[PDB]
Design an enzyme around this catalytic site. Structure first.
Site, PDB file in Angstrom:
ATOM      1  N   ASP A   7       0.846  -1.183   0.000  1.00 57.09           N
ATOM      2  CA  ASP A   7       0.000   0.000   0.000  1.00 57.09           C
ATOM      3  C   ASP A   7       0.881   1.231   0.000  1.00 57.09           C
ATOM      4  O   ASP A   7       1.768   1.329   0.842  1.00 57.09           O
ATOM      5  CB  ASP A   7      -0.850   0.053   1.272  1.00 57.09           C
ATOM      6  CG  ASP A   7      -1.520   1.406   1.449  1.00 57.09           C
ATOM      7  OD1 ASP A   7      -0.978   2.269   2.202  1.00 57.09           O
ATOM      8  OD2 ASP A   7      -2.550   1.637   0.787  1.00 57.09           O
ATOM      9  N   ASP A 105      -3.889   2.578  -5.081  1.00 60.59           N
ATOM     10  CA  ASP A 105      -2.605   2.559  -4.390  1.00 60.59           C
ATOM     11  C   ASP A 105      -2.254   1.274  -3.655  1.00 60.59           C
ATOM     12  O   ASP A 105      -1.381   1.294  -2.775  1.00 60.59           O
ATOM     13  CB  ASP A 105      -2.498   3.778  -3.461  1.00 60.59           C
ATOM     14  CG  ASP A 105      -2.991   3.512  -2.056  1.00 60.59           C
ATOM     15  OD1 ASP A 105      -3.997   2.772  -1.825  1.00 60.59           O
ATOM     16  OD2 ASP A 105      -2.362   4.096  -1.151  1.00 60.59           O
ATOM     17  N   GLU A 106      -2.897   0.158  -4.005  1.00 55.19           N
ATOM     18  CA  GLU A 106      -2.589  -1.095  -3.309  1.00 55.19           C
ATOM     19  C   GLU A 106      -2.830  -2.330  -4.151  1.00 55.19           C
ATOM     20  O   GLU A 106      -3.705  -2.353  -5.024  1.00 55.19           O
ATOM     21  CB  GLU A 106      -3.345  -1.180  -1.974  1.00 55.19           C
ATOM     22  CG  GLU A 106      -4.809  -1.619  -2.076  1.00 55.19           C
ATOM     23  CD  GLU A 106      -5.628  -1.286  -0.827  1.00 55.19           C
ATOM     24  OE1 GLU A 106      -6.429  -2.135  -0.372  1.00 55.19           O
ATOM     25  OE2 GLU A 106      -5.467  -0.176  -0.278  1.00 55.19           O
TER      26      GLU A 106
HETATM   27  N1  LIG Z   1     -11.356  11.743  -3.149  1.00 50.14           N
HETATM   28  C1  LIG Z   1     -10.938  10.914  -2.178  1.00 50.14           C
HETATM   29  N2  LIG Z   1      -9.831  10.180  -2.359  1.00 50.14           N
HETATM   30  C2  LIG Z   1      -9.522   9.376  -1.317  1.00 50.14           C
HETATM   31  C3  LIG Z   1     -10.188   9.218  -0.131  1.00 50.14           C
HETATM   32  N3  LIG Z   1      -9.545   8.293   0.679  1.00 50.14           N
HETATM   33  C4  LIG Z   1      -8.506   7.927  -0.036  1.00 50.14           C
HETATM   34  N4  LIG Z   1      -8.428   8.542  -1.267  1.00 50.14           N
HETATM   35  C5  LIG Z   1      -7.395   8.431  -2.303  1.00 50.14           C
HETATM   36  C6  LIG Z   1      -6.267   9.379  -1.880  1.00 50.14           C
HETATM   37  C7  LIG Z   1      -5.270   8.489  -1.156  1.00 50.14           C
HETATM   38  O1  LIG Z   1      -3.918   8.962  -1.135  1.00 50.14           O
HETATM   39  C8  LIG Z   1      -5.412   7.221  -1.988  1.00 50.14           C
HETATM   40  C9  LIG Z   1      -5.028   5.953  -1.243  1.00 50.14           C
HETATM   41  O2  LIG Z   1      -5.886   5.768  -0.125  1.00 50.14           O
HETATM   42  P1  LIG Z   1      -5.320   5.278   1.300  1.00 50.14           P
HETATM   43  O3  LIG Z   1      -6.578   4.938   2.049  1.00 50.14           O
HETATM   44  O4  LIG Z   1      -4.387   4.088   1.137  1.00 50.14           O
HETATM   45  O5  LIG Z   1      -4.743   6.569   2.054  1.00 50.14           O
HETATM   46  P2  LIG Z   1      -3.272   7.202   1.892  1.00 50.14           P
HETATM   47  O6  LIG Z   1      -2.396   6.465   0.913  1.00 50.14           O
HETATM   48  O7  LIG Z   1      -3.499   8.643   1.430  1.00 50.14           O
HETATM   49  O8  LIG Z   1      -2.703   7.311   3.393  1.00 50.14           O
HETATM   50  P3  LIG Z   1      -1.872   6.016   3.863  1.00 50.14           P
HETATM   51  O9  LIG Z   1      -0.551   6.243   4.544  1.00 50.14           O
HETATM   52  O10 LIG Z   1      -2.409   4.669   3.493  1.00 50.14           O
HETATM   53  O11 LIG Z   1      -2.576   5.983   5.176  1.00 50.14           O
HETATM   54  O12 LIG Z   1      -6.791   7.143  -2.378  1.00 50.14           O
HETATM   55  C10 LIG Z   1     -11.373   9.967   0.077  1.00 50.14           C
HETATM   56  O13 LIG Z   1     -12.103   9.957   1.073  1.00 50.14           O
HETATM   57  N5  LIG Z   1     -11.682  10.789  -1.022  1.00 50.14           N
HETATM   58 CA   LIG Z   2      -4.777   1.978   0.204  1.00 50.54          CA
HETATM   59 CA   LIG Z   3      -2.044   4.174   1.130  1.00 52.25          CA
END
Ligand SMILES: Nc1nc2c(ncn2[C@H]2C[C@H](O)[C@@H](COP(=O)(O)OP(=O)(O)OP(=O)(O)O)O2)c(=O)[nH]1
Ligand SMILES: [Ca+2]
Ligand SMILES: [Ca+2]
Ligand SMILES: [Ca+2]
Length: 341
Positions: A7, A105-106
């Site tokens: 991820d 992203d995963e």
């Molecule tokens: N528009 C939108 N995109 C989202 C949302 N949640 C996640 N994404 C998109 C942006 C994130 O960078 C990407 C990957 O989701 P993740 O849940 O793995 O979060 P992220 O990689 O940002 O943080 P990480 O260190 O996993 O916790 O998907 C949301 O609520 N709305």
């Molecule tokens: Ca993810």
């Molecule tokens: Ca992520």
DNA sequence: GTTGGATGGTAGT
DNA sequence: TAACGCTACCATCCAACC
């Protein structure tokens, strides 16, 4: 069986830091501006520096700016992040062709035929992390275990910039000790229902009557949790096949006026049909988010594929039905296509 | 009796 | 004070089909 799950860390915000390295080390917030007023919309994600102060995915942009007025706010450029993602998924396919891409992203890799034990798996995980750093300058978290669920749990435990193996002895420990709320697929609603039943851990599902469990949380969730508790979960890694494709947009102002809503709906169909990329759907649903943020839909499945012209015609009829059957104003409007030939 | 489309709930990202 | 966006899988209800 050995599964490796990857991820990407704070993904959209991390890509923006790669594109502009002067941003690294201070708060970066990636935003979905809805156009309704200045700073209307939601945060797509923020880097960990911003998360320290409560700024994270899903919060209103106005709320983020109240907390961190001096953070860097950037508009979501999803096409750019998708370019990066696709390159990284291709890098991962070089380590195993048995890959299940689960989101932007995963992905899960079945590496059973590529490594012989968890020591070798851990070293492959580090090679993967190093490859993605070299090629894309993106840090990721790797989880490794005997199945998809525990590989995901391993990554969740290790993020950010982590790598973690959950071996067979730790799987059995976690079945006894892990808060059942932290199992993938158990959100707040199921977690509370399990709590009422006195089910706090996976092992507890083995001493409740299946009929009682099934009755409360449903057949599928009950079977899922029991399979995990018996240490007999074995869902294979499979190539992802998209089942639906859609677009929903936010209107400038809430409306029940067909001619006012139509332009937005048609924009959603155009972008959706573009996304289909040779896919031909047999079903269309018009989806409306009402003024009070409720989500309603009306759909139709045809015996044959839906041309873009039929999508236009049918979508108006479905929007008309929503208007006829629901009194509320509409805030967001869009479409989803499914049942691909 | 049984399928399976329409509609919505839940989860996660 | 504001609440985007996209997708997967499951449940329930009920008309159509055995
Ligand atoms: N528009 C939108 N995109 C989202 C949302 N949640 C996640 N994404 C998109 C942006 C994130 O960078 C990407 C990957 O989701 P993740 O849940 O793995 O979060 P992220 O990689 O940002 O943080 P990480 O260190 O996993 O916790 O998907 C949301 O609520 N709305
Ligand atoms: Ca993810
Ligand atoms: Ca992520
Ligand atoms: Ca949970």
């Amino acid at each position: 069986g050995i599964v490796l799950f990857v991820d990407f860390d704070y993904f959209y915000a991390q890509v923006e830091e790669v594109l502009n390295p002067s941003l690294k080390g201070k708060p970066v917030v990636v935003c979905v501006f809805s156009g309704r007023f200045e700073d209307s919309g939601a945060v797509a994600t923020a880097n960990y520096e911003a998360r320290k102060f409560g700024v994270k995915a899903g919060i209103p942009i106005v709320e983020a700016k109240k907390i961190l007025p001096n953070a860097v706010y950037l508009p979501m450029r999803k096409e750019v992040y998708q370019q990066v993602s696709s390159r990284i998924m291709n890098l991962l396919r070089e380590y195993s062709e048995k890959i299940e891409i689960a989101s932007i992203d995963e992905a899960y890799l079945d590496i059973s035929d590529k490594v012989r034990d968890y020591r070798e798996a851990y070293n492959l995980g580090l090679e993967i992390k190093n490859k993605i750093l070299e090629k894309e300058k993106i840090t990721v978290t790797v989880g490794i275990s005997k199945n998809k669920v525990f590989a995901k749990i391993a990554a969740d435990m290790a993020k950010p910039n982590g790598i973690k193996v959950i071996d067979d002895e730790e799987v059995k420990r976690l079945i006894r000790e892990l808060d059942i709320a932290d199992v993938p697929g158990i959100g707040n609603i199921t977690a509370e229902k399990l709590k009422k039943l006195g089910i706090n851990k996976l092992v507890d599902t083995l001493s409740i009557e299946f009929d009682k469990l099934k009755g409360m949380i449903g057949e599928a969730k009950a079977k899922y949790l029991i399979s995990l508790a018996r240490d007999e979960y074995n869902e294979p890694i499979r190539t992802r096949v998209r089942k639906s494709i859609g677009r929903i947009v936010t209107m400038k102002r809430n409306s029940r006026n067909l001619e006012e809503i139509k332009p937005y709906l048609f924009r959603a169909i155009e972008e959706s049909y573009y996304k289909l990329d040779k896919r031909i759907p047999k079903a269309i649903h018009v989806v409306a988010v009402t003024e009070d943020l409720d989500i309603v839909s009306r759909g139709r499945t045809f015996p044959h594929g839906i041309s873009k012209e039929t999508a236009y015609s049918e979508s108006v009829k479905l929007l008309q039905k929503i208007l006829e059957e629901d009194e509320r104003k509409i805030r967001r409007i869009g479409v989803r296509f499914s049942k691909f030939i």
